[PDB]
Ligand binder design. Structure first.
Ligand SMILES: CCCCCCSC[C@H]1CN(Cc2c[nH]c3c(N)ncnc23)C[C@@H]1O
Ligand SMILES: CCCCCCSC[C@H]1CN(Cc2c[nH]c3c(N)ncnc23)C[C@@H]1O
Lengths: 229, 229
């Protein structure tokens, strides 16, 4: 079996996995805790990064460069843009962009810097495995584009703009950064999100109400994927 | 001697060091090139990260976690906010914040996420070493606060807002993220910037005109610091 990283942003996104696993060891590193467990012939490394692009980049980098992760599964919640998504629905990202990476003053498109592309892709084999798991367990699973940036979106105008520019189905604050790290380090990456809110007026209240439950839905799914890897 | 990382964002910020060093080895890693050289009893690792917070976070993490850097010196250019700064002037950061890290919907201040602080500090001993180098070489050196985010600022209103909220003397797109990584991994960090522009109307044109020269000023200074480490 391979060494698998499971990464979230907040305690709520990862604690459900630790409760399921029960037996694990801890290491304090990178001003955070990294958790180690054996599960179905796989060595797991788990952590929550803390919120946002920088924190999630650091944790993905640590999990691969220091702890030797060979595959990385991201689990957590997101703000829904696609009106067909409801709170609780699962979306995996086929590709992701940073909507707030902006050198447009120099005539390049939003999300672009030299040497990189606007969109980073996730791993096709992991995505196909997720589709198999979803079918086997009768779980509804949607494929889409995720827009990542360092703002909590709770504004219909901003939602509409990001949706339009990137054809994005959801937003969050860690996906594109984690996917970029994994691509750069040649590690297959899967990004799964359960919707906690619709990223408009009162998104903060929906997020507060639904984060715990939506986080569990995503967490359960990525652990099921580990069984089939 | 210690293992020293020297990091910039763009080729212009690091190529002057490579030209001075002359002899070095290259390793392709993390969708980038990392350069290795010996200088005055120190093993150096150098790179330009590519632009922005995610790219710079990844490079700092790689330099420390994979290549074992024990100190990190960041060199490059910046947009001046403090009206006493002129193009070409050197500023080292005493502390830095991410102005575009925004969960203010939840009633926290701009730049804050739970588990972290608004400002990250750089290393006092390195900062004092820089002051000694500046005095010895008769170079004007200013201490200040740097605001970091993923936008090229070329707008007087944005400049004024970021300046006001963070009491920032300059802006750039990599400092706070690099400083955060170094702090998290217990590596002393120094962030030096030479002004390339004043971050208002026509900042893009000043940046184009002055980036090469200002980048050399910063690069020369960090190499002088390596001699005294
Ligand atoms: C008590 C501490 C204050 C709560 C701060 C919560 S920020 C949102 C979380 C959840 N995650 C995904 C996400 C869920 N909903 C989102 C939205 N509307 N905009 C941006 N991101 C998201 C990104 C980020 O990790
Ligand atoms: C086709 C040409 C594309 C050029 C794109 C250059 S973005 C600015 C650089 C330089 N660096 C520092 C910096 C210098 N001036 C800045 C400003 N006004 N705003 C934000 N950052 C900066 C950040 C970033 O690494």
């Amino acid at each position: 079996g391979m060494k698998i990283a499971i990464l979230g942003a907040m305690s709520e996104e990862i604690t459900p996995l630790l409760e399921t696993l029960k037996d694990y060891t801890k290491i304090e590193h990178a001003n955070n805790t990294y958790y180690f467990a054996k599960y179905k012939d796989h060595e797991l490394v788990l952590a929550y990064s803390k919120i946002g692009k920088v924190n999630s980049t650091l944790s993905a980098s640590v999990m691969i460069e220091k702890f030797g992760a060979q595959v990385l599964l991201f689990t957590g919640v997101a703000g829904a843009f696609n009106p067909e998504l409801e709170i609780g629905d699962l979306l995996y990202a086929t590709k992701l962009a940073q909507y707030d990476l902006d050198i447009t003053a120099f005539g390049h498109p939003l999300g672009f810097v030299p040497g990189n592309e606007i969109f980073i892709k996730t791993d096709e084999k992991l995505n196909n495995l997720a589709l198999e798991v979803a079918k086997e367990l009768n779980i509804k699973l949607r494929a889409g584009i995720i827009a990542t940036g360092d703002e909590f979106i709770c504004d219909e105008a901003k939602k509409a703009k990001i949706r339009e520019i990137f054809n994005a189905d959801a937003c969050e604050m860690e996906g594109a950064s984690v996917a970029l790290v994994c691509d750069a380090l040649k590690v297959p990456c899967f990004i799964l999100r359960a919707m906690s809110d619709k990223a408009g007026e009162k998104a903060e209240f929906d997020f507060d109400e639904f984060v715990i439950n939506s986080a569990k839905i995503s967490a359960n799914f990525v652990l099921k994927m580990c069984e089939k890897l």
